[PDB]
Amino acid sequence: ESDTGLAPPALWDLAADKQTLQSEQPLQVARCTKIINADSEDP
């Protein structure tokens, strides 16, 4: 068997019905980078 991050349902059972659907299509995905430099009065 495996785990894959499970738990007994008493704390995530109410979390797993409609909150997952609101963390997909509204919630986007961003990335991290570094900033080299900048400019003045305009980005």
Partner: protein, 350 residues
């Protein structure tokens, strides 16, 4: 038919699950992870993921749409903290070695005395030493002496070769140092034995490339957690290399290691035991004369003696016999021992 809510979440996530890398954890239901190509993503984390085992350095499960943390993944069979622990017993206790009894009381007072009789220290309020360095000519008695002391102990023992700490995943190096020293702290006051430490510590060079910095940070964190000074619980560390001059100087200076044991040369006294020890587990016939082999050759180690006994066993099997005669030993003494005999000022010094 009863298990429903777990079955839905087995079906809620995406099917082609990828494998991610924890970097940093922010406790606001989202964090920063790392993909396999070093691309990193501001993604989120679910609620059923059992946020108790999330450590920076652990592996997780990611998606393709939003790449959020699907679920935490286990170590996936990475036995890098459990295999190096010696479970069974090593070789013979003290009668295997011979002629090194100058050096026995040093290690016996440094390891056995702080554990078995910690009262001599408390009569005068003097701390035991932490580290012990074993250097000398290569293959002299260093590995044989460490197994000799580790056999006579009443605590757990670690066997570290040194090359099984060096990996390339940019965290795995100094993590396993913390994971071992946590195992040594939580368990019995084990004996850390990290052999070949000259591969990780020498002369402290810093380059701009990314091939050398993975050694220096692992070395630096080792000296940090050796001298963490929070709760070590009397963990005895034994370090050993062949040479000593091309090593790290701040590990030599006191506060770190105060025992620098040297393992000098030989003689024709200690040899005769090793001849008897190596010629014990064989069909040694009653026609062999080892004393002529002992007196004649005057510079050899036990690894030479082992190479004699094996070549003696091979010559007996080439002539389709079980037992070994003296002649197989004579030829093996004349064959194998001619590889290094070079350089002597004979007849000059009485």
């Amino acid at each position: 038919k009863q298990e429903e809510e777990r079955s839905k979440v087995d079906d809620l996530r995406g099917t082609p699950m990828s494998v991610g890398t924890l970097e940093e954890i922010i406790d606001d239901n989202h964090a920063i992870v790392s993909t396999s190509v070093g691309s990193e993503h501001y993604v989120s984390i679910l609620s059923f993921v059992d946020k108790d085992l999330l450590e920076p350095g652990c592996s997780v499960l990611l998606n393709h749409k939003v790449h959020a943390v699907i679920g935490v993944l286990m170590d996936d069979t990475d036995p890098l903290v459990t295999v190096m622990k010696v479970e069974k017993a090593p070789q013979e206790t003290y009668a295997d070695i011979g002629g090194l009894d100058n050096q026995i009381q040093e290690i016996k007072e440094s390891v056995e005395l702080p554990l078995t009789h910690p009262e001599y220290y408390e009569e005068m309020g003097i701390k035991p030493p932490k580290g012990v360095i074993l250097y000398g000519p290569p293959g002299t008695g260093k590995t044989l002496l460490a197994k000799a002391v580790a056999n006579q102990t009443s605590a757990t023992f670690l066997r570290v070769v040194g090359s099984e700490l060096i990996q390339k995943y940019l965290g795995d190096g100094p993590k396993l140092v913390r994971e071992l020293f946590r195992v040594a702290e939580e368990h019995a006051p084990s004996i850390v034995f990290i052999d070949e430490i000259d591969a990780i510590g020498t002369k402290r060079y810093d380059s701009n490339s990314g091939g050398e910095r993975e050694i220096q940070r692992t070395m630096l964190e080792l000296l940090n957690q050796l001298d963490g000074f929070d709760s070590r619980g009397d963990v005895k560390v034994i370090m050993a290399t062949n040479r000593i001059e091309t090593l790290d100087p701040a590990l030599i200076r006191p506060g770190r290691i105060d025992r620098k044991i040297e393992f000098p040369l030989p003689d024709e006294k200690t040899k005769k035991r090793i001849f008897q020890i190596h010629t014990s587990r064989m069909t040694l016939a009653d026609d062999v004369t080892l004393d002529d082999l002992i007196m004649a050759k005057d510079d050899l180690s036990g690894a030479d003696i082992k190479a004699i006994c094996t070549e003696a066993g091979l010559m007996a099997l080439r002539e389709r016999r079980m037992k070994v005669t003296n002649e197989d030993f004579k030829k093996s003494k004349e064959n194998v021992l001619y590889k290094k005999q070079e350089g002597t000022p004979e007849g000059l010094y009485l």
